[PDB]
Amino acid sequence: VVGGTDADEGEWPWQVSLHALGQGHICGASLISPNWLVSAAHCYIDDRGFRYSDPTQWTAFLGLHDQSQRSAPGVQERRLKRIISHPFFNDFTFDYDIALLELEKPAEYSSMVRPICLPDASHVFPAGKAIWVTGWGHTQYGGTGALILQKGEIRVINQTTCENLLPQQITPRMMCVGFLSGGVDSCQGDSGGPLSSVEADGRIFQAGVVSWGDGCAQRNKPGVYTRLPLFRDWIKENTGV
The missing domain is CATH 2.40.10.10 (Trypsin-like serine proteases)
Incomplete structure (x- = not known):
């Protein structure tokens, strides 16, 4: 992260x-x-x-x-x-x-x-919602893994925006989460981990699975995650x- x-x-x-x-x-x-x-x-x-x-x-x-x-x-x-x-x-x-x-x-x-709690098939994690990514992956692209588990707050990005940022690469199973300005993102070694979303009574649900990205934390290149519902x-x- x-x-x-x-x-x-x-x-x-x-x-x-x-x-x-x-x-x-x-x-x-x-x-x-x-x-x-x-x-x-x-x-x-x-x-x-x-x-x-x-x-x-x-x-x-x-x-x-x-x-x-x-x-x-x-x-x-x-x-x-x-x-x-x-x-x-x-x-x-x-x-x-x-x-x-x-x-x-x-x-x-x-x-x-x-x-972690699993979301029902009909649940929508809305664009703009803050969610958390966690892992022991690299703390900078091309950098080194973290000994201590890291956490970062990122936001769900609109699917049309996602598709346009990464042309011919985003399928409906994928979701972009992060910031267009970069800064906070998952990275090598975080793959497979969960996106954690705080729901209505504070219980945490899994929103997605860390999957891939073009570099890490770069402007206009938010991380791509597999959707869970x-x-x-x-x-x-x-x-x-």
Whole structure:
């Protein structure tokens, strides 16, 4: 996250860190039930030197605050049993960039580990609404990852504006969130994490999944996120949640 601040310990108890064995933190995810996480499909694509699509190559850390203190009290370590990437995911356009990760053993809810709420299919996160992005990704484009979880406040951008800022690249599964002036944005390593939106009684709902961007925090280049309401039924069908 560029332009953000250190989160308070336990402030985003649904935020998860996914590590590929021997590689460190690669992407984020969100806890949605005792057995399931939501993340981005693009994080689990094989490359010539590493099988990121193999669930056995991963470790999820729940209740994590500082990447250098992964054994701190309250942090829970879990392996993955399965990765369900959306069947329509396109690795060139990044359309349908969403995946479901099944924990090998259930998470234990605590003050530091708690699921985020999922929005109903009909819910609209309105243009202009302030929402939060969190993660351990780079704090500057081409920069370095954050040891301490970062948070940043960004706003939903009108879809027509989004489509015009990134021509021939924005599908209806995507949403631009950030600022036309730049400044605050997600970045490498934040992928897969949740957008957190404070709703009517203060409860937090997941508005989207960190997906991609042209650089980070640049003017007229807000980050692109996968929308969540559109996938409510798909999540229910595949997880029971």
